[PDB]
Design an enzyme around this catalytic site. Structure first.
Site, short mmCIF file in Angstrom:
data_model
loop_
_atom_site.label_atom_id
_atom_site.label_comp_id
_atom_site.label_asym_id
_atom_site.label_seq_id
_atom_site.Cartn_x
_atom_site.Cartn_y
_atom_site.Cartn_z
N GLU C 162 0.84 -1.30 0.15
CA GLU C 162 -0.02 -0.17 0.07
C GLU C 162 0.74 1.22 0.01
OE1 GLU C 162 0.41 0.84 3.64
OE2 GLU C 162 0.30 2.99 3.22
N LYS C 221 8.70 -0.75 -0.25
CA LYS C 221 7.94 -0.04 0.71
C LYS C 221 8.64 0.55 1.94
CE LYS C 221 4.06 1.28 2.84
NZ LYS C 221 3.65 2.71 2.43
N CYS C 277 4.56 5.97 10.65
CA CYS C 277 5.24 5.37 9.61
C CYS C 277 6.95 5.69 9.31
CB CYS C 277 4.51 5.70 8.18
SG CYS C 277 2.84 5.02 8.21
#
Lengths: 233, 462, 464
Positions: C162, C221, C277
């Site tokens: 994602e 990612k 994150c």
């Protein structure tokens, strides 16, 4: 007292004012409290290093390191004085003429052993400075020996970079900077107005001994940037 | 538009001053631009049909306005007296001794220009640093002007850094990503800044001209080269991780670079960045931080160099481990010696460093590069007996590969993907390794494995 | 290409799985998409007029296809059985104990899904990791499938990370910079990869769909978020240098960013980056490096965090120094507590850390944030009923209360309102000297008027 001089430069205190205040306490006394570019002579460093070595031999590393500080501090006081000079000349001294006034370890002698002048001169040589050195008592041959790589009877660096002046005015003629490394009484009597006219500008006087104290305003009026040990810029 | 620059003098007729001033003249017909230098031979060349610098497009630019409003002369003093604006465009070599040896910039030439400008100036002039300078260089020019003032002498100091790369200098001058001009936040500083903006406004749109204070300007030039270098060290660091996991660094770099906030430039893994700008600039930044008691900042930027050095070292070690850690009198081919393709420039080339590692193992290097002169390779690999015994410079790749244990590609020249590898295989010793230090052989892997090479590359698991 | 996905199941109805699957359904009318979760309350909400997640555009997307080809259910097992493609979209919290405490990702939920999928599956299915996973997560899923095999069971494992940010999730899904799909370099793997490409091809152009091996995908990612965080730490490192030299970090950032090779995004200096994150991914990458004996790469990325930490610490120190190195019982306004503007999220907010530094000096903090719940601020500032928080921390209902009698106003989050406040009024009621510490450059261009008013105004990346 040298360590205090660094703190004076950083804060605005004056090391001579502080030394006088401390020294008037009769338990401390007023002797051996004169800030400088660093102590010299054939006794202090050698005796302290000897003491340090004895400590280590005797498994007393804490006492070793306590005393090693007397040396480290002296080395730092030298190195930071040279760095002030070099920074003031834009970190480049290649082919700049600089006057070194005083080579003896202290005034009124020809002894140069462990003189701070040797160390400040070596720092400026490592920048490629063209040093013109004046001292009223030290033989010229001894200065050449002191700045030469030992076991070198003719050093290329010494003859390329070092000139021994027969008078202070020669040494300052065309200089960027006048660096006073020994406290000879004559240096406070120099004709600074004359010196200023023939220097390159900005013209710096770096007083490594507080010997020009009280001349400062007069030297600023003539148009020098006058800096010394233990006074804020 | 209070003040209008009508005469420009540039002290320094090198790679920066010459082309920049030539483009200014071309774009500003009403401005007289006089490039000066003490080197008579070089000035003569600028006035000749063989310019002393080769740059695509430069000859046309120079020939279109030389003698009209563009002039090259050894008469430095007159050009300064006449000038409204004086560019200082001299080199600032790294100190080779003393405080900051190997890292700090040496201001001697900048200072000499400043002193000469003040000696030859009266009235109003704008003085502008165009060369890559350390932060605080303008302060020093200021100190010199302030210390040598004259009645009615009013010199304003600006920073206007160059963003040129070799081979693209004209394109970069005609169509710059931005023009950067730094000056004091005073009415006089802003007047000076605006005058130089007006010069650039003859051909650069206002929205691409960025005005700042003088320190911001000097720091941006150094910082930009450092951010660019960081991207390479960052993707190189990922290449090590790819080799350990099975990821492929080119797949990862593409994935990362498609995020428009990161962008897809400067993400190509390699044996290491090179050239006369990246390491120099990063190291000067690290030195400036230490000087200013910013050790955290210093150690942050040193990682960019420590990573580049580790990438070079682990690549050499792969080569060495593949031949069992004994290369003494093994012949190895080095293809590519320039720091990057399409130049003869070897400055900080990873080929130097790879080669020095193999030489330290006793390897017999046979080195090919299509544009680097042989004498440059010999100098670069000298301190010279180690070079003459171990280094051979080949006139073609096939000689260098003939009887070699390994072929090491160190520079991404396009010709290396066109070589006759079947041929090279016939004449190498077995096992025949190719170590691709640039990902230039990607897509020939399968067939090179078929031919019989053990082909290995950066950022790919063995 | 050869195989066609007609039924999708997504295990996990959170902020990743819900929106992604909702957009997939919207764009692929012929595919049935069933989002499942054990949390019955949450599934009910997805089936309600008040969705459990607020995202611009999400309600419209969900209401346009829920009940047609989009479904939300607690019947996990049936959804799996029926599915051609199963997304695993569960969280991977950081381990809180043991090997890699505080840094390594905890695969427990991923493993539970893999075990459940193999227990409920027959025939051919494609299983795809959609959650942010550590490198090798797919290896583990594959081990579990290989160790619990059945006749004619053929499970293929893909990675499909994602790239969504809060507040832009729908835009990011409808118009992504890229879609990343990782799979094995085998005929089976490539079959699977192509099937999932075809799903995305219903609305994403082929040139924006990047296919890779599985490890490259997982690593991209993590690496992408590390590169983004590195730009902030790099420009923050410059801000320190600016303060020491007279350069201005906004001038320098603009100058650097206009080089198109660097770009002008993510170059805004601050008191420090935050969120759930950036720190977490960088630390995960450093742990992975250490675990693979790459200490040089480990120490290279650790710098991104050490720098953020320093940026926070030096800001706190300027505050404390300016107050004479004593802040005991001095009232300070903390304006902003969310990790960034336009959110209530306080995860790894620089405001928490600045606040703890001032608490450690005995400051009396009055904290104002328009959107963060007061209970959350109390939790965030408490030790893991906390006396230090009740003694030292007041949560203000308006920004004027927070400044009233304060010695310093510290801006920690870049809410737009903070530049609009009545600073003339705030100045009247502060103790003097009155300081404003702007940790976000949000008060640029009010400087002169604030100094005129009488503040000592200080900011990041500007010399005092």
């Amino acid at each position: 007292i040298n360590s205090i001089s660094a703190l004076c430069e950083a804060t605005g205190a004056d090391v001579e004012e502080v030394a006088t205040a401390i020294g008037m306490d009769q338990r401390i006394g007023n002797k051996f409290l004169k800030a400088s570019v660093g102590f010299g002579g054939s006794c202090f460093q050698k005796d302290v290093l000897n003491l340090v070595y004895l400590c280590e031999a005797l498994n007393l590393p804490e006492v070793a390191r306590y005393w090693q500080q007397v040396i480290d501090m002296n080395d730092y006081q030298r190195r930071r004085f040279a760095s002030r000079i070099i920074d003031s000349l834009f970190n480049t001294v290649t082919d700049k003429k600089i006057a070194i006034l005083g080579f003896a370890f202290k005034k009124d002698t020809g002894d140069t052993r462990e003189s701070s002048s040797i160390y400040i001169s070596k720092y400026l040589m490592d920048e490629g400075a063209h040093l013109h050195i004046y001292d009223p008592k030290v033989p010229r041959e001894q200065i050449v020996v002191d700045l030469s790589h030992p076991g070198v009877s003719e050093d290329d660096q010494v003859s390329r970079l070092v000139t021994i002046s027969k008078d202070p005015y020669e040494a300052c003629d065309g200089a960027h900077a006048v660096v006073i490394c020994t406290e000879w009484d004559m240096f406070k009597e120099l004709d600074y107005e004359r010196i200023h006219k023939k220097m390159l500008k900005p013209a710096f006087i770096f007083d490594g001994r507080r010997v020009l104290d009280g001349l400062h305003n007069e030297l600023q009026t003539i148009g020098f940037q006058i800096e010394t040990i233990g006074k804020k810029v | 538009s209070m003040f209008e620059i009508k005469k420009i003098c540039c002290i320094g007729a090198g790679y920066v001053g010459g082309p920049t001033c030539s483009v200014i003249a071309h774009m500003c017909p009403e401005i007289r631009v006089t490039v000066v230098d003490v080197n008579e031979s070089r000035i003569n060349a600028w006035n000749s049909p063989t310019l002393p610098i080769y740059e695509p497009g430069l000859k046309e630019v120079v020939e279109s306005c030389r003698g009209k409003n563009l002039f090259f002369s050894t008469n430095i003093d007159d050009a300064i007296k006449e000038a409204d604006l004086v560019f200082i465009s001299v080199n600032t070599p790294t100190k080779t001794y003393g405080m900051g040896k190997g890292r700090a910039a040496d201001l001697k030439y900048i200072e000499a220009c400043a002193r000469r400008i003040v000696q030859n100036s009266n009235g109003y002039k704008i003085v502008t640093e165009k060369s890559a300078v350390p932060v605080r260089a303008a302060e020093s020019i200021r100190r010199i002007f302030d210390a040598n003032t004259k009645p009615n002498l009013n010199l304003q100091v600006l920073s206007n850094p160059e963003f040129l790369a070799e081979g693209t200098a004209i394109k970069d001058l005609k169509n710059p990503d931005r023009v950067l001009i730094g000056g004091d936040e005073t009415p006089e500083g802003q007047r000076a800044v605006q005058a130089l903006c007006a010069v650039y406004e003859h051909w650069v749109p206002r929205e691409k001209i960025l005005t700042t204070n003088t320190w911001s300007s000097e720091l941006s030039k150094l910082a930009a080269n450092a951010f660019l270098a960081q991207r390479i060290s960052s993707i190189n660091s990922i290449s090590a991780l790819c080799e350990a996991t099975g990821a492929d660094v080119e797949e990862v770099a593409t994935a990362i670079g498609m995020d428009q906030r990161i962008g897809n430039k400067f993400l190509k893994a390699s044996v290491g960045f090179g050239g006369s700008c990246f390491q120099k600039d990063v190291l000067n930044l690290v030195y400036l931080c230490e000087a200013l008691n910013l050790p955290e900042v210093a150690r942050y930027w040193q990682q960019v160099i420590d990573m580049n050095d580790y990438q070079r070292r682990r690549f050499a070690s792969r080569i060495i481990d593949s031949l069992f850690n004994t290369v003494t009198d093994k012949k190895i081919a080095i293809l590519g010696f320039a720091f990057k393709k399409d130049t003869g420039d070897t400055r900080e080339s990873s080929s130097i460093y790879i080669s020095k590692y193999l030489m330290d193992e006793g390897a017999h290097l046979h080195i090919y590069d299509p544009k680097v002169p042989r004498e440059q390779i010999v100098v670069d690999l000298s301190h010279d007996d180690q070079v003459s015994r171990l280094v051979t410079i080949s006139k073609d790749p096939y000689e260098a590969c003939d009887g070699a244990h390994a072929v090491v590609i160190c520079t991404e020249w396009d010709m290396f993907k066109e070589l006759d590898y079947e041929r090279i295989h016939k004449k190498m010793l077995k096992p025949a390794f190719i170590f691709d230090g640039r990902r230039v052989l990607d897509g020939l892997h399968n067939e090179l494995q078929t031919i019989g090479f053990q082909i290995e590359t950066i950022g790919k698991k063995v």
